[PDB]
Amino acid sequence: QPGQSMEIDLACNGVQITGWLPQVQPDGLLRWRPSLLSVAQGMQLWLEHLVYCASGGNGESRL
């Protein structure tokens, strides 16, 4: 679904996290890469999904 990039500011353990998550649709996070399934790609989506669920963002994340 069409979506816009959002900016993230969070407080975790008194540490501020700043960054951008591109192409955030109202359903959730959607990423696609042309490679083999690996745990490095799952860990990459994991950190991106946790920072997505910490600020609003009700929904799933798929890769």
């Binding site: 990039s5 900016e7 700043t18 951008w20 591109p22």
Partner: protein
């Protein structure tokens, strides 16, 4: 064909090997008119010129006499538009073609996309930001005490706040930095709960540290709470570091995909922003970000080939639109003048010129006739301005004699065996500025005569002990950039050149470790922009050449903090004041559309 004819231009040094090979590959076997037209286009693009209008290429009055070999080829068809567009090497912009011919100006697709991106961003995509006029007026009233007369600084703050993209134009010492502090203070005070992210940027790290200290002194003159002082920007970085320019490659970490994360951005000394960097900065900006540019219209970097700000402020002389003059009257609480006629609405409303500042009276008389110029340098002497008539060589030696007087304090500190840090600050007390690069008057001319005057007089014997040196090209490894100065002396560990880091720490560099260095006793007026000099001297040739221009002499006078001296002919200097730098860029032609 014309190929072998173009091979002579390399020996004649009228064309670089890049221009000739680009002309053989792209134009190919087509008419020799198309081959040399891409040759002079690649040459002017190499020197920094944006485009190549067809009228300049046709007239025999143009340079590169290899052009006279065109009459034997083009056969005087008198149509450059019909010949060039017919070939596949030139198109109207529809096809993916290297060269583009549109408004009679021929130039590369690179310059075409950069001209289109810049001229559109100022004409389009910008939105008028509507805020409460009563509250915005109450804020500006508390910043500026005097409401009795029209304040140019009050209009500059109102225009920048009401418009997303804006430019504040003004000369050195006119209070530009103070107006920015009033703009940033009124910006943070406007939105209490909304996020305010401010960034300071400069093309050079030199003027960047000049921006941080000057903005710091001006901001502490105004009261703010702890939340406002928390949103105060920290420091400024180089525009290349802001965009994340890699030293090895040309790629940028931001570009179109990753926008800069910001609210407002202030770019100081926008005169050194060439068209490539302005076009690369526009695509990096998000849609919610307001950008403010700082600089002057008459600075030589604005009128130089490839510059943007020069043609932007050229329309500022017309004035504000009739409607904005009524809107700014309700904001500033004064009567704002309205410009006559309607040329470009979005561009004229986004510009502001600060006319309030011997240096100021002379520079203001430069734009006027020579009658006010000769009268200002003459009577009352202003104590900041002196004039020496230079014709015969006997006055040329006395020029070098007073040149030693300006370096008199500097030359002694070299021979007094001081520390490098104080001497770095000492070399900023005097500098020499010359129009031409070569000849009896010029960079190549003075450096030989000046160092010869250092042999005749025993002040310093000749890397020689106590020599000042400037860096010719940027270096990412050593942390030193073009336009920076250094002092070479023996601390007892060895002969090493020392530099002053923005953090205040001294950094020793071996003489063989510098990427590029040259004798800095005389500087090119373009290379000294952004630097400050307590005393300055201008060297102009007795010859009449178009190289000497108005914006060159302007940047020479504005390059001096307080003291200034001049050696020039009243006939040569005043006539050069009338002559102004000609810009070929098609930006001002698109604003008229």
């Amino acid at each position: 064909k014309l190929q072998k004819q173009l091979l002579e231009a390399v020996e004649h040094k009228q064309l670089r090997p890049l221009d000739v090979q680009f002309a053989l590959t792209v134009a190919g076997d087509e008419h020799p008119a198309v081959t040399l037209a891409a040759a002079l286009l690649s040459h002017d693009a190499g020197e920094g010129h944006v485009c190549l209008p067809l009228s300049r290429l046709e007239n025999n009055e143009a340079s590169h006499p290899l052009l006279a070999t065109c009459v034997s080829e083009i056969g005087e068809l008198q149509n450059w538009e019909e010949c060039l567009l017919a070939s596949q090497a030139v198109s109207r912009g529809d096809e993916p073609t290297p060269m583009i011919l549109c408004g009679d100006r021929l130039y590369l697709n690179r310059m075409w996309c950069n001209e289109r991106t810049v001229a559109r961003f100022f004409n389009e995509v910008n939105h008028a930001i509507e805020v409460d006029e009563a509250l915005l007026a109450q804020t500006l009233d508390k910043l500026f005490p005097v409401s009795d007369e029209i304040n140019w600084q009050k209009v500059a703050a109102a225009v920048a706040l009401t418009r997303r993209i804006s430019v504040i134009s003004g000369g050195p010492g006119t209070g530009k930095t103070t107006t920015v502090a009033k703009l940033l203070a009124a910006l943070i005070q406007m939105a209490d709960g909304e996020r305010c992210r401010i960034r300071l940027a400069a093309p050079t790290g030199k003027a960047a540290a000049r921006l941080t200290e000057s903005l710091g002194k001006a901001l502490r003159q105004l009261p703010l709470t702890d939340e406002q002082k928390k949103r105060i920007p920290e420091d400024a970085s180089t525009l290349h570091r802001l965009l994340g320019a890699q030293p090895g490659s040309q790629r940028l970490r931001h570009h179109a995909g990753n926008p800069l994360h910001l609210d407002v951005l202030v770019v100081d000394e926008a005169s050194m922003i060439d068209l490539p960097m302005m076009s690369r900065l526009i695509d990096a900006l998000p849609d919610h970000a307001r950008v403010i540019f700082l600089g002057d219209r008459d600075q030589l970097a604005s009128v130089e080939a490839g510059a943007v700000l020069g043609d932007i402020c050229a329309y500022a002389n017309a004035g504000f639109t009739a409607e904005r003059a009524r809107q700014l009257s309700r904001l500033t609480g004064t009567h704002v003048p309205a410009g006559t006629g309607t040329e470009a609405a979005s561009l004229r409303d986004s510009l502001c010129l600060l006319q309030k500042s011997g240096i100021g009276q002379l520079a203001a008389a430069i734009n006027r006739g020579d009658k006010t110029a000769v009268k200002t340098v003459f009577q009352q002497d202003f104590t900041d301005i002196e004039k020496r008539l230079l014709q015969s060589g006997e006055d040329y030696i006395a020029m070098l004699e007073e040149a030693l007087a300006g370096y008199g304090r500097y030359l002694d500190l070299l021979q007094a065996r001081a520390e490098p840090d104080l001497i770095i600050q000492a070399f900023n007390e005097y500098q020499l500025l010359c129009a031409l690069r070569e000849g009896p008057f010029g960079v190549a001319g003075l450096n030989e005569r000046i160092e010869q005057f250092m042999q005749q007089k025993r002040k310093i014997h000749r890397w020689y002990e106590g020599r000042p040196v400037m860096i010719a090209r940027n270096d990412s490894a050593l942390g030193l950039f073009n336009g920076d100065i250094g002092i070479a002396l023996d601390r007892g560990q060895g002969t090493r050149v020392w530099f002053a880091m923005p953090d205040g720490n001294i950094k020793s560099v071996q003489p063989s470790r510098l990427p590029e260095h040259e004798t800095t006793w005389a500087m090119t007026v373009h290379k000294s922009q952004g630097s400050e000099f307590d005393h300055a001297a201008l060297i102009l040739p007795s010859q009449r050449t178009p190289v000497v221009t108005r914006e060159l002499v302007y940047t020479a006078v504005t390059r001096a903090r307080r003291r200034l001296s001049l050696y020039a002919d009243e006939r040569i200097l005043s006539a050069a004041i009338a002559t102004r730098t000609e810009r070929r860029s098609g930006l001002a032609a698109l604003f008229s559309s």
